[PDB]
């Protein structure tokens, strides 16, 4: 029979940002159980409140053995074998769980399916809302949600979140406010209450003197309030949250929350008007005490190193005089705001406050934009700098960080990345893709060491011996980026195992090869190139005299392939798009195949064999721009 079974675990209150996936895992386990226990069903609905996870199996067939005993055996393990970021030791037991287990509801339409865990057996009695509600019996598996609605709990997470959203729209439309809701913020809120009632509070207009970033940080990040703006996007002195109650004494709770937020806001105003006191040179000099790390040294000398790096990057990258001067100034002062109490209370707001303070002191706003952006990206899916100066600044910052932190041997591990250096490298790669620059990660060792010897040699013993492994760490991050975009492993191992080790070359070659891989004329080309590289790898020539002599040629395919190679080198240049490069190289595949058909390179005359190997190694060197194409498997 297509009966309906009901399983609710009632717990202590759980962290919001993980409540939903846990019940999703439970759905998964229940479904997997039913497949593994060879059961049929129509649906599995889930219910989540901060105190309970519930599954409802609709249309459950009644035999695999009968349903009751299969559930008895399986449900205990279903509950136990669920997985969490954290698990906890309860009263006398080493049994670890996300939160200790308080009650269990296991009902087969009207039947009590006993499945017993610790001190709490399984019964048909559920607990209602923790403040407004009481415990309640459960009659039928279908009635569950309705019955909970009596005890003033919204079990359906989707319906509860919708309810909060509807109240949000009601408040936005009643006071002509523009409430802007965040989705992880709403996710937290939805999984923090069981019977919601949205509310709004006000705060004093004098605090509107301050930048919106501090206010939104306070509200959203700490009090989890939704800042109120107008149509013109001006920030209004109001905030919104949701109470875990009804509309009883809503005014008093709102007043208490206003009091708390106003405490935080007064702290912020004090920090603002206290940080305003000092001039920029004072912060710069005080930065000498701030060590960037134990074994590295201070943040001020780090800023000097980044300043030199930024000057070189402006030179190499081609920026106008104004851009170069602004970049130099920013690299001079971009990290000063790190020594402030404003960031001491708001760790999230670091960097941006430097932009606001320096711009406030009558400086150039582009410098402030770079200061705001040298933290960007803020996450793995975060935003990238909108200005050249900020991108260059962040790249230089992370370059210094990774070089030094590998000079200290702190290479991040599989689960431990103490300094987000993996994220820093990932951000560098993402920015490079967005901007497209020629980037030798091959010779940066010599560049960094060389230039520190030139200017400041205190940071100079084993600092490029540890910078060679960094090039492969950046490479691993690029490979993981490609595997995030599903690219074939052989394309990966080809663009990765390149001699150039240039980021833009890797990206462009991978894009071109992901495009042309569906053409019929592709496989033959690949075979020819692979064959060529296989023959060229063991040549005993100095790769500086590869001049090909047409007089040592036996047939004409050698002569004209040599002419084609020459005219390709006369066109193949460093200022060429990847698609043109590949098309031109591939176009010669009939030439290479008829070359090998006609010209046998395994020659009983040494000098001619050397000449032919030169003619082949020139193309091999041109190929190695794209990488090690022998690492493409075509089938």
């Amino acid at each position: 029979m297509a009966k309906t079974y009901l399983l609710e675990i009632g717990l202590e209150e759980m962290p919001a940002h993980v409540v939903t996936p846990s019940v999703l895992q439970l759905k998964e386990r229940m479904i997997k159980f039913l497949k593994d226990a060879r059961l049929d069903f129509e649906d599995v609905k889930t219910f989540s409140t901060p105190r309970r996870l519930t599954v409802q199996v609709l249309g459950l067939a009644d035999k695999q053995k009968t349903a009751a005993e299969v559930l008895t055996g399986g449900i205990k393990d279903v509950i136990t074998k669920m997985n969490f970021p954290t698990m906890m030791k309860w009263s006398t037991y080493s049994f670890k769980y996300i939160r200790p287990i308080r009650w269990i509801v296991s009902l087969l339409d009207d039947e009590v399916v006993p499945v017993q865990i610790l001190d709490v057996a399984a019964g048909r009695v559920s607990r209602g809302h923790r403040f407004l509600g009481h415990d309640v019996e459960i009659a039928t598996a279908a009635d569950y949600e309705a019955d909970l609605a009596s005890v003033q709990v919204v079990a359906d997470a989707a319906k509860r979140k919708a309810t909060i959203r509807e109240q949000i729209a009601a408040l936005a439309n009643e006071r002509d406010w523009q409430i802007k809701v965040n989705e992880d913020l709403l996710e937290e809120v939805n999984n923090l209450v069981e019977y919601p009632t949205a509310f709004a509070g006000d705060f004093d207009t004098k605090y509107l003197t301050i930048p919106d970033e501090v206010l939104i940080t306070s509200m959203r990040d700490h009090q989890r309030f939704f800042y109120v703006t107008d149509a013109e996007d001006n920030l209004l002195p109001h905030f919104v949250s949701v109470r875990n109650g009804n509309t009883d004494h809503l005014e008093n709770v709102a007043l208490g929350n206003q009091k708390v937020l106003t405490a935080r806001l007064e702290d912020a105003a004090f920090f603002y008007h206290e940080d305003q006191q000092h001039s920029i040179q004072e912060y710069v000099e005080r930065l000498k005490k701030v060590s960037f790390h134990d074994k590295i040294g201070t943040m001020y000398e780090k800023m000097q190193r980044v300043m030199i790096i930024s000057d070189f990057l402006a030179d190499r990258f081609g920026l106008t005089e104004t851009e170069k001067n602004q970049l130099h100034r920013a690299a001079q002062i971009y990290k000063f705001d790190l020594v402030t109490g404003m960031v001491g209370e708001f760790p999230e707001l670091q960097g941006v406050m430097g932009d606001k303070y320096a711009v406030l002191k009558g400086e150039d706003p582009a410098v402030g934009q770079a200061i705001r952006e040298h933290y960007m990206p803020i996450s793995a899916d975060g935003d990238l700098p909108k200005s050249k100066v900020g991108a260059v600044l962040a790249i230089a910052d992370k370059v210094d960080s990774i070089t030094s932190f590998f000079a200290v041997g702190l290479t991040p591990s599989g689960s431990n990345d103490p300094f987000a250096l993996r994220r820093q490298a990932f951000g560098i790669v993402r920015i490079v893709r967005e901007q497209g620059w020629d980037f030798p990660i091959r010779q940066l060792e010599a560049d960094i060491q060389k230039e520190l010897v030139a200017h400041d040699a205190t940071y100079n013993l084993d600092f490029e011996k540890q910078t060679a492994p960094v090039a492969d760490f950046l490479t691993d991050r690029v490979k993981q980026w490609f595997n995030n975009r599903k690219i074939r492993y052989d394309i990966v191992d080809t663009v990765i195992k390149g001699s150039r080790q240039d980021i833009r070359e890797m990206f462009k070659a991978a894009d071109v090869l992901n495009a042309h891989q569906d053409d019929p004329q592709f496989k033959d080309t690949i075979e020819a190139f692979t064959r060529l590289l296989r023959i060229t790898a063991k040549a005993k020539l100095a790769a500086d005299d590869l001049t090909v002599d047409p007089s040592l040629f036996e047939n004409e395919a050698e002569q004209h392939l040599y002419d084609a190679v020459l005219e390709l080198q006369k066109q193949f240049t460093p200022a060429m798009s990847m698609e043109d490069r590949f098309k031109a190289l591939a176009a010669l595949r009939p030439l290479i195949v008829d070359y090998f058909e006609q010209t046998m390179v395994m020659s009983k005359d040494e000098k001619v064999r050397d000449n032919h190997l030169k003619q082949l190694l020139t193309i091999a060197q041109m190929i190695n721009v794209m990488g090690d194409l022998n690492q493409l498997i075509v089938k």
């Binding site: 030791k89 923790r130 875990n244 008093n252």
Partner: protein
């Protein structure tokens, strides 16, 4: 209008209610600390298999929180009310709600959040999982199941509730400053603690003797290790508390970089782990008297 509870009354009501739940009313441990978790009635008594149900007030001196008496929520010393019950009863949240009800707080009239905070104290190796109880947007409590205290697997599990007396009183008495508190018999918290705030602030910031602090820490560590060596747990633990407060004084003075901070915490971690080891060893050396007599009391 109804009367808000003085600090006095808050302490009395909490103590009486938890006594109604079989907790023991110990007194604050006589050493300078930064939280009541480090008092032996919480720390040492929560390990081993011996049951222990206590509740006691504790002055916590946090030098880094000294504000020269202008900031009315950050103080050189604030006071916590520690509830520590082992093994944890399944109604611990119910009893916590009942305690808030006895404090003149109607849950029907207010919004309370259990926002998870995996509590950690690295110096003593204390680990715990639990919530920060937020009241009307204001954090008022620390409610935690202990999991690893002094590096040791905790059996039975000890529940802890930390009431923040300064913020709790400021909310309940509806004052905007902690020094505007009706402490007891109508006397303001400022009227007593205004001088200690300024004096200890200058002590921790601009007046302490640095080489003195260094020698004090080193000698305390030497002596605590020697005392553990013979097997004198409590005096060595007192010296460990002295080491911890010494580290707090130096770190607030501006002597400890991030480097040497970790080393100090490692040394304190080793001290606390060894102290816990020896204490459990000696309680096993005594047949665990608390187990025998508490089981005798149940029947």
């Amino acid at each position: 209008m109804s009367k808000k509870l003085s600090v006095q009354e808050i302490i009395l009501t909490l103590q009486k209610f938890w006594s109604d739940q079989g907790c023991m009313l110990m007194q604050s441990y006589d050493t300078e600390k930064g939280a009541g978790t480090m008092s032996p009635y919480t720390f040492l008594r929560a390990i081993g298999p011996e049951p222990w149900n206590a509740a006691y007030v504790e002055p916590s001196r946090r030098p880094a929180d000294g504000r020269y008496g202008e900031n009315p929520n950050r103080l050189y010393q604030h006071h916590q009310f520690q509830v520590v019950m082992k093994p944890s009863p399944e109604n611990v949240q119910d009893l916590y709600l009942q305690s808030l009800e006895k404090l003149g707080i109607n849950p029907l009239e207010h919004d309370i959040r259990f926002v998870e905070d995996n509590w950690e104290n690295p110096s003593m190796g204390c680990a715990g999982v639990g919530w920060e109880v937020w009241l009307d947007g204001m954090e008022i409590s620390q409610f935690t199941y202990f999991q690893q205290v002094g590096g040791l697997e905790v059996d039975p599990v000890t529940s802890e509730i930390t009431y923040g007396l300064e913020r709790l009183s400021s909310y309940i008495q509806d004052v905007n400053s902690v020094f505007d508190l009706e402490w007891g018999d109508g006397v303001k918290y400022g009227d007593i603690f205004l001088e200690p705030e300024f004096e200890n602030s200058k002590y921790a910031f601009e007046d302490s003797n640095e080489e003195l602090l260094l020698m004090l820490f080193d000698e305390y560590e030497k002596e605590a290790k020697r005392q553990i060596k013979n097997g004198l747990v409590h005096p060595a633990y007192d010296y460990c508390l002295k080491c911890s407060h010494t580290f707090n004084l130096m770190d607030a003075r501006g002597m400890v970089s991030v480097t040497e901070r970790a080393g100090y915490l490692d040394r304190i971690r080793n001290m606390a782990k060894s102290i816990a080891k020896e204490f459990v060893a000696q309680r096993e050396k005594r047949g665990f008297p608390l187990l025998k007599h508490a089981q005798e009391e149940t029947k």
